[PDB]
Amino acid sequence: GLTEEQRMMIRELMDAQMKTFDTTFSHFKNFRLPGVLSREEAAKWSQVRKDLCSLKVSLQLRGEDGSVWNYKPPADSGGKEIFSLLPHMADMSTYMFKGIISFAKVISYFRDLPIEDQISLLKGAAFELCQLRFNTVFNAETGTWECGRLSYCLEQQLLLEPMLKFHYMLKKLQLHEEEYVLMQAISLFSPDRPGVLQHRVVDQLQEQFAITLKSYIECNRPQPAHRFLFLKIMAMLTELRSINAQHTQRLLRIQDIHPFATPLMQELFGITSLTERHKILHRLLQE
């Protein structure tokens, strides 16, 4: 069994998740959609083409009336068309990041951290928590993220893109709500995010959540078979941290030739004292 302390830790994370995770995406509205339409710079485009060609999805929008709009992205031709779903993606991700910021704020341990640590933790973990929330609505039989009335369907080769292989693998583990939120807490409270000051306090908080997840697993799962689930999960978090760095770099390359990030993404991801360079995040954190 878990200590009362560990049960309380889980309760608070579960509370936080239920209050901030719009699982049916019923409040995701007013987003943009794809419309009805040099030596060194080429090197930039060529990396960008690679950065994107692997992550293509068609988009489906189910209307309340039973109607269906389906969008199939264009093949990579000359150039620009490759960025067609980016403004919509920016909107979905920004929407997701806002729920991630609210999640963090409801957690006492996060709130007790100095504001500048809260900012640094949110910048380092944002993409990771968003992807962890996305895995819970990912349908691995169809290669589709089911987002309420919206759906994103991936257009042996997939398993080659680290983030796609990550969704498949994570999904296979058949985690409980509790395990997903403990994964989120562990990712959130990473002592080694750049610019974190209270390294020791964050490191200890992270070990607490990891121990709770470890005990949760010992106690809630048939022994022998789930003997290494915790470590499998820790390995997935290590790989996710690396995918985060990789994807942040792609984001910056695309932004360089085709600025498109929302103002909140610009703050989260280092796009153009710590509180002055992060006023949106700061305002979201203090309300």
Ligand SMILES: CCOP(=O)(OCC)C(=Cc1cc(C(C)(C)C)c(O)c(C(C)(C)C)c1)P(=O)(OCC)OCC
């Ligand atoms: C670092 C910021 O990353 P980012 O939030 O930026 C959104 C504009 C981002 C988000 C993202 C990534 C994936 C993959 C990787 C699993 C395919 C998704 O499937 C989805 C949806 C919404 C369709 C579920 C969103 P990116 O990894 O994928 C964009 C297609 O962007 C990388 C630049």
